[PDB]
Amino acid sequence: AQNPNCNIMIFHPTKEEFNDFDKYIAYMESQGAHRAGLAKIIPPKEWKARETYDNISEILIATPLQQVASGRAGVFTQYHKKKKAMTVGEYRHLANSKKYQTPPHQNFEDLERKYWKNRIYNSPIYGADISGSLFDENTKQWNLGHLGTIQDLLEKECGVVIEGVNTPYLYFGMWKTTFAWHTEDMDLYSINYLHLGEPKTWYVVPPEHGQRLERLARELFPGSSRGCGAFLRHKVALISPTVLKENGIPFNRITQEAGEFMVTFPYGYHAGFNHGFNCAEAINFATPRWIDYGKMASQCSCGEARVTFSMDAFVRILQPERYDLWKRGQD
Ligand SMILES: O=C(O)CNC(=O)C(=O)O
Ligand SMILES: [Mg+2]
Ligand code: NI
Ligand SMILES: [Zn+2]
C-alpha cells in the first residue's frame, strides 16, 4: 500500500505531464497521495496562469464577510457578518491597514503560533466565494475554468444525464481569514490555485480517519451536534493543532505559496488560514473513484448548510432515499 502513514505529498510534473489533468490525478493516486486528504502540485517552470495581475483591482466583492469568533483560542466557531460591497483595490488597502495587516514575525511557524494564540480576538474580512476566474483563456493546462464537469463525469460513469453547471470561485483573503473544518459538498475533490499574494496554511485529516474528527467535533460542540447530525457541513467550527494532538486525531499541515496548486481528495477534512492579502481560485471536480464517496456522503438536512443548484441532482441520483429529507432542508 502506497503512502501508508498518509503524509502530504508534493508533486513536480513536467510540462508534458501537465497536459492531461485526469491522467495526472490518477498518477498521484497510484502513488498514494489521496491517503493524506491533500496534495501540493508545483507547476512546471514554463507554465503561467496569466501574464500579470496588474489589472484586477476593479473586480467587485459584492458581499465581504467579517468572520466573528466565539469560544476559546483552540476551540471556536465563526459566523459571517455581511459588509458593504467593495472593490479588490479597496479590499487590498484594507488588508494592508494597521488594523488588519500581518504582524511582524520570524517565519511561518512563528506566524502559525500567533494565529492560534490570537485569532479569536480579531474579526478579519474575507472576500470569499465570488463566481469567476483569473486564468487566461489561452492557458490550456490546469485551467480551473476549463475542467471536465462533474455532471459529465456522472453521466460518463453512470449513464444518467443531469442538469447543473460547475464553475470556479475566487477568494480574496487577509491576515487571519479562516476556513473552518469541512469536506467538500457530496465529498467531492477540490482544486485550489493561489494566484497571488501571501501564503495559505492548511490542516488535513486523512479520509480513512475522518470519523475520528467527527466524533471529537460532537464532543467539543455539543449543542451544534444535537441540532444537526452533520453540522460540520455548516462550515463554522475550528479546532487547533494543539487540541487535535491532545485528542489523538491524526492530521498533517502544509503551507501553500503563490503559484502552487492544492488538491483535496474525497472525504479529506481540511481547515486553514491566510497569512496576509491574497487571491485564490478553487473549484470542485470528480473522478471515477469519487462515485462511491458521493453515494455515502453525509448530509445536513437542518436547513443551515444551504448549497448550490447543482447539488440537487447529485443527491437525487446517488442518494434517492435521502433526497426528500435533504430537499426539505433546502426549502
Ligand atoms: O481557500 C479557502 O478559503 C477554502 N478553500 C477550500 O476549502 C478548498 O479549496 O477546498
Ligand atoms: Mg479589474
Ligand atoms: Ni474545501
Ligand atoms: Zn445542519
XYZ file of N, CA, C and O in Angstrom, residues 204-322:
476
model
N -5.177 19.024 7.497
C -5.969 17.975 6.843
C -6.002 16.710 7.638
O -4.901 16.307 8.173
N -7.114 16.025 7.716
C -7.260 14.701 8.320
C -7.360 13.651 7.232
O -8.127 13.809 6.288
N -6.550 12.555 7.283
C -6.660 11.517 6.241
C -8.109 11.029 6.096
O -8.808 10.825 7.137
N -8.639 10.791 4.876
C -10.001 10.277 4.725
C -10.344 9.057 5.560
O -11.444 8.944 6.156
N -9.386 8.136 5.709
C -9.663 6.934 6.489
C -9.913 7.220 7.928
O -10.435 6.353 8.652
N -9.544 8.377 8.421
C -9.736 8.811 9.815
C -10.702 9.944 10.051
O -10.845 10.516 11.165
N -11.502 10.264 9.013
C -12.406 11.383 9.151
C -13.427 11.254 10.222
O -13.828 12.240 10.898
N -13.909 10.037 10.478
C -14.919 9.826 11.546
C -14.325 10.109 12.919
O -15.061 10.497 13.847
N -13.019 10.044 13.107
C -12.378 10.430 14.414
C -12.519 11.895 14.600
O -12.820 12.378 15.739
N -12.317 12.707 13.571
C -12.533 14.113 13.700
C -14.019 14.437 13.988
O -14.321 15.313 14.862
N -14.930 13.790 13.316
C -16.363 13.990 13.582
C -16.737 13.685 15.036
O -17.469 14.476 15.664
N -16.198 12.615 15.583
C -16.551 12.271 16.981
C -15.977 13.322 17.893
O -16.664 13.718 18.840
N -14.760 13.815 17.701
C -14.222 14.884 18.514
C -15.095 16.106 18.394
O -15.360 16.815 19.393
N -15.462 16.497 17.160
C -16.281 17.689 16.987
C -17.614 17.586 17.743
O -18.082 18.601 18.322
N -18.234 16.420 17.733
C -19.519 16.275 18.511
C -19.253 16.514 19.993
O -20.101 17.179 20.655
N -18.126 16.071 20.520
C -17.776 16.310 21.930
C -17.511 17.771 22.195
O -17.883 18.286 23.292
N -16.816 18.463 21.326
C -16.405 19.855 21.531
C -17.461 20.891 21.251
O -17.355 22.033 21.762
N -18.429 20.536 20.453
C -19.510 21.422 20.053
C -20.836 20.721 20.298
O -21.599 20.368 19.371
N -21.187 20.458 21.599
C -22.271 19.543 21.893
C -23.739 20.101 21.490
O -24.506 19.322 20.968
N -23.931 21.356 21.640
C -25.218 21.968 21.176
C -25.403 21.860 19.657
O -26.464 21.511 19.122
N -24.320 22.103 18.978
C -24.362 22.063 17.462
C -24.668 20.632 17.038
O -25.441 20.373 16.092
N -24.065 19.684 17.681
C -24.222 18.290 17.363
C -25.670 17.823 17.564
O -26.196 17.086 16.743
N -26.311 18.288 18.656
C -27.740 17.973 18.860
C -28.622 18.614 17.798
O -29.633 18.030 17.430
N -28.249 19.769 17.327
C -29.014 20.468 16.270
C -28.987 19.805 14.909
O -29.910 20.003 14.094
N -27.888 19.054 14.611
C -27.666 18.541 13.252
C -26.687 17.397 13.275
O -25.551 17.575 13.763
N -27.032 16.288 12.603
C -26.197 15.102 12.597
C -25.006 15.240 11.641
O -24.200 14.315 11.588
N -24.954 16.344 10.898
C -23.785 16.649 10.016
C -23.381 18.112 10.077
O -23.195 18.781 9.118
N -23.280 18.666 11.330
C -23.058 20.049 11.463
C -21.717 20.647 10.948
O -21.652 21.827 10.714
N -20.753 19.729 10.714
C -19.537 20.289 10.041
C -19.794 20.776 8.581
O -19.067 21.714 8.176
N -20.908 20.314 8.012
C -21.388 20.866 6.713
C -21.734 22.345 6.831
O -21.781 23.078 5.822
N -21.939 22.902 8.048
C -22.196 24.339 8.204
C -20.982 25.223 8.007
O -21.085 26.393 7.864
N -19.768 24.586 8.081
C -18.543 25.236 7.862
C -18.299 26.426 8.779
O -17.966 27.527 8.395
N -18.414 26.162 10.086
C -18.249 27.154 11.165
C -17.313 26.728 12.266
O -17.001 27.628 13.083
N -16.816 25.520 12.382
C -16.084 25.056 13.559
C -14.591 24.995 13.313
O -14.126 24.431 12.286
N -13.844 25.498 14.266
C -12.389 25.439 14.267
C -11.836 24.709 15.475
O -12.354 24.899 16.606
N -10.827 23.884 15.262
C -10.146 23.119 16.297
C -8.700 23.233 16.002
O -8.264 22.944 14.863
N -7.862 23.632 16.953
C -6.420 23.898 16.705
C -5.624 22.644 16.606
O -5.996 21.595 17.110
N -4.392 22.743 16.034
C -3.494 21.559 16.028
C -3.181 21.063 17.437
O -3.037 19.845 17.629
N -3.015 21.961 18.385
C -2.726 21.528 19.746
C -3.852 20.668 20.309
O -3.661 19.613 20.942
N -5.114 21.108 20.097
C -6.239 20.345 20.568
C -6.392 18.991 19.853
O -6.714 17.940 20.419
N -6.134 18.978 18.516
C -6.148 17.709 17.787
C -5.100 16.717 18.394
O -5.430 15.569 18.544
N -3.895 17.256 18.595
C -2.805 16.358 19.174
C -3.224 15.884 20.560
O -3.082 14.658 20.862
N -3.847 16.709 21.362
C -4.207 16.277 22.731
C -5.224 15.187 22.711
O -5.341 14.372 23.664
N -6.115 15.140 21.670
C -7.117 14.156 21.496
C -6.799 12.997 20.507
O -7.631 12.204 20.171
N -5.534 12.911 20.102
C -5.049 11.813 19.304
C -5.584 11.757 17.905
O -5.678 10.683 17.307
N -6.039 12.912 17.357
C -6.575 12.897 15.967
C -5.437 12.987 14.940
O -4.655 13.895 15.001
N -5.357 12.017 14.026
C -4.328 12.105 13.040
C -4.529 13.282 12.047
O -5.653 13.424 11.531
N -3.497 14.031 11.812
C -3.586 15.159 10.822
C -2.239 15.531 10.304
O -1.199 15.165 10.924
N -2.202 16.358 9.272
C -0.982 16.952 8.760
C -1.184 18.373 8.418
O -2.372 18.853 8.406
N -0.146 19.134 8.218
C -0.174 20.529 7.878
C 0.789 20.879 6.784
O 1.859 20.202 6.646
N 0.499 21.905 5.999
C 1.377 22.379 4.948
C 1.041 23.769 4.586
O -0.152 24.199 4.714
N 1.968 24.615 4.134
C 1.718 25.942 3.679
C 1.836 26.048 2.204
O 2.877 25.618 1.590
N 0.830 26.568 1.530
C 0.753 26.828 0.086
C 1.203 28.272 -0.173
O 0.746 29.188 0.479
N 2.056 28.430 -1.204
C 2.546 29.732 -1.641
C 2.026 30.094 -2.987
O 1.528 29.207 -3.746
N 2.113 31.367 -3.345
C 1.644 31.818 -4.615
C 2.226 31.031 -5.788
O 3.457 30.718 -5.762
N 1.443 30.651 -6.759
C 1.915 29.860 -7.861
C 1.754 28.388 -7.699
O 2.167 27.593 -8.578
N 1.218 27.892 -6.590
C 1.105 26.485 -6.286
C -0.397 26.046 -6.269
O -1.289 26.804 -5.773
N -0.661 24.813 -6.679
C -1.952 24.164 -6.552
C -1.995 23.270 -5.388
O -1.012 22.566 -5.053
N -3.184 23.169 -4.734
C -3.507 22.136 -3.783
C -4.704 21.339 -4.261
O -5.650 21.975 -4.817
N -4.712 20.050 -4.062
C -5.865 19.219 -4.345
C -6.334 18.609 -3.084
O -5.529 18.010 -2.340
N -7.606 18.722 -2.720
C -8.202 17.948 -1.668
C -8.956 16.757 -2.235
O -9.549 16.849 -3.333
N -8.864 15.644 -1.529
C -9.424 14.359 -2.010
C -10.724 14.031 -1.295
O -10.998 14.567 -0.195
N -11.587 13.180 -1.892
C -12.885 12.873 -1.281
C -12.790 12.525 0.183
O -12.019 11.642 0.602
N -13.590 13.187 1.009
C -13.728 12.948 2.414
C -12.421 13.301 3.191
O -12.230 12.867 4.328
N -11.589 14.170 2.619
C -10.451 14.744 3.328
C -10.841 16.028 4.039
O -10.920 17.083 3.398
N -11.062 15.944 5.325
C -11.393 17.179 6.127
C -10.234 18.133 6.082
O -9.068 17.699 6.314
N -10.503 19.408 5.901
C -9.464 20.415 5.870
C -9.980 21.715 6.516
O -11.181 22.008 6.528
N -8.992 22.532 6.957
C -9.194 23.840 7.588
C -7.926 24.651 7.407
O -6.857 24.057 7.066
N -7.990 25.950 7.611
C -6.754 26.747 7.481
C -6.977 28.208 7.554
O -8.040 28.695 7.944
N -5.890 28.929 7.218
C -5.930 30.409 7.366
C -4.986 31.098 6.398
O -3.990 30.482 5.922
N -5.260 32.315 6.057
C -4.404 33.140 5.192
C -3.429 34.006 6.012
O -3.741 34.481 7.090
N -2.249 34.177 5.416
C -1.149 34.912 6.088
C -1.264 36.390 5.889
O -0.606 37.132 6.666
N -1.953 36.902 4.924
C -1.980 38.270 4.531
C -2.811 38.422 3.250
O -3.462 37.394 2.818
N -2.801 39.557 2.588
C -3.602 39.748 1.400
C -3.220 38.719 0.380
O -2.047 38.479 0.015
N -4.233 38.020 -0.196
C -4.012 37.008 -1.261
C -5.292 36.838 -2.115
O -6.361 37.348 -1.759
N -5.113 36.075 -3.183
C -6.199 35.694 -4.026
C -6.008 34.305 -4.478
O -4.999 33.943 -5.092
N -7.002 33.439 -4.218
C -7.048 32.030 -4.618
C -8.253 31.813 -5.506
O -9.286 32.482 -5.427
N -8.193 30.761 -6.337
C -9.305 30.268 -7.206
C -9.476 28.847 -6.919
O -8.488 28.068 -6.886
N -10.735 28.367 -6.780
C -10.952 26.942 -6.494
C -12.246 26.447 -7.150
O -13.159 27.244 -7.469
N -12.303 25.148 -7.396
C -13.469 24.510 -7.975
C -13.513 23.078 -7.497
O -12.467 22.452 -7.230
N -14.710 22.495 -7.409
C -14.881 21.083 -7.186
C -14.761 20.297 -8.469
O -15.107 20.771 -9.549
N -14.315 19.035 -8.353
C -14.263 18.103 -9.525
C -14.478 16.725 -8.996
O -14.420 16.415 -7.817
N -14.693 15.817 -9.961
C -14.927 14.384 -9.712
C -14.023 13.538 -10.651
O -13.558 14.003 -11.676
N -13.836 12.302 -10.196
C -13.221 11.231 -10.977
C -14.058 10.007 -10.752
O -14.939 9.932 -9.912
N -13.754 8.878 -11.507
C -14.481 7.653 -11.197
C -14.440 7.164 -9.786
O -15.435 6.654 -9.239
N -13.289 7.363 -9.102
C -13.163 6.948 -7.737
C -14.062 7.712 -6.734
O -14.421 7.226 -5.669
N -14.449 8.918 -7.135
C -15.374 9.714 -6.268
C -16.745 9.076 -6.106
O -17.394 9.298 -5.044
N -17.252 8.361 -7.146
C -18.682 7.988 -7.126
C -19.083 7.283 -5.789
O -20.114 7.622 -5.207
N -18.230 6.354 -5.343
C -18.574 5.684 -4.115
C -18.630 6.585 -2.875
O -19.492 6.420 -1.999
N -17.775 7.605 -2.865
C -17.846 8.622 -1.798
C -19.093 9.477 -1.892
O -19.785 9.784 -0.864
N -19.491 9.868 -3.095
C -20.722 10.571 -3.238
C -21.988 9.884 -2.763
O -22.858 10.439 -2.170
N -22.002 8.576 -2.989
C -23.106 7.731 -2.541
C -23.203 7.638 -1.020
O -24.301 7.468 -0.473
N -22.092 7.758 -0.338
C -22.030 7.625 1.122
C -21.942 8.944 1.855
O -21.983 8.926 3.101
N -21.884 10.114 1.189
C -21.640 11.382 1.825
C -22.761 11.692 2.806
O -23.982 11.568 2.501
N -22.390 12.206 3.972
C -23.384 12.757 4.873
C -24.047 13.941 4.293
O -23.574 14.665 3.367
N -25.201 14.193 4.890
C -25.847 15.371 4.518
C -26.482 16.160 5.717
O -26.870 15.518 6.728
N -26.428 17.474 5.606
C -27.140 18.419 6.533
C -28.599 18.487 5.922
O -28.778 18.983 4.785
N -29.548 18.207 6.723
C -30.962 18.498 6.375
C -31.655 19.494 7.346
O -32.897 19.658 7.197
N -30.876 20.137 8.316
C -31.440 21.027 9.336
C -31.759 22.334 8.741
O -32.404 23.132 9.431
N -31.272 22.690 7.557
C -31.549 23.954 6.968
C -30.379 24.860 6.950
O -30.386 25.842 6.211
N -29.341 24.554 7.737
C -28.254 25.542 7.842
C -27.400 25.523 6.614
O -27.106 26.611 6.096
N -27.027 24.328 6.094
C -25.893 24.280 5.106
C -26.191 24.948 3.748
O -25.300 25.525 3.139
N -27.442 24.964 3.340
C -27.888 25.660 2.093
C -26.782 25.827 0.999
O -25.792 26.615 1.150
N -26.954 25.054 -0.074
C -25.943 24.915 -1.139
C -26.503 25.171 -2.562
O -27.688 25.472 -2.764
N -25.592 25.078 -3.528
C -25.861 25.294 -4.929
C -26.969 24.413 -5.533
O -27.263 23.304 -5.107
N -27.476 24.976 -6.614
C -28.412 24.347 -7.516
C -27.988 22.942 -7.977
O -28.790 22.030 -8.054
N -26.708 22.774 -8.267
C -26.227 21.581 -8.915
C -26.123 20.397 -7.908
O -26.240 19.162 -8.219
N -26.164 20.678 -6.619
C -26.164 19.530 -5.687
C -27.434 18.729 -5.676
O -27.374 17.497 -5.412
N -28.568 19.300 -6.093
C -29.829 18.631 -6.180
C -29.718 17.346 -6.942
O -30.158 16.288 -6.406
N -29.211 17.319 -8.178
C -29.131 16.143 -8.947
C -28.241 15.118 -8.362
O -28.467 13.928 -8.524
N -27.129 15.543 -7.717
C -26.209 14.559 -7.132
C -26.921 13.779 -6.016
O -26.860 12.560 -5.981
N -27.674 14.434 -5.154
C -28.443 13.773 -4.090
C -29.514 12.879 -4.712
O -29.741 11.749 -4.297
N -30.263 13.492 -5.667
C -31.373 12.759 -6.272
C -30.984 11.485 -6.924
O -31.658 10.461 -6.776
N -29.844 11.407 -7.623
C -29.381 10.220 -8.321
C -28.593 9.372 -7.410
O -28.750 8.089 -7.372
N -27.609 9.823 -6.614
C -26.758 8.993 -5.813
C -27.364 8.586 -4.477
O -26.941 7.510 -3.958
N -28.275 9.395 -3.939
C -28.835 9.151 -2.618
C -30.323 9.259 -2.606
O -30.946 10.058 -1.842
N -31.060 8.498 -3.472
C -32.512 8.728 -3.552
C -33.282 8.541 -2.228
O -34.280 9.244 -2.099
N -32.852 7.676 -1.330
C -33.511 7.533 -0.018
C -33.437 8.866 0.752
O -34.378 9.179 1.485
N -32.350 9.564 0.690
C -32.119 10.802 1.491
C -32.729 11.932 0.837
O -32.797 13.014 1.526
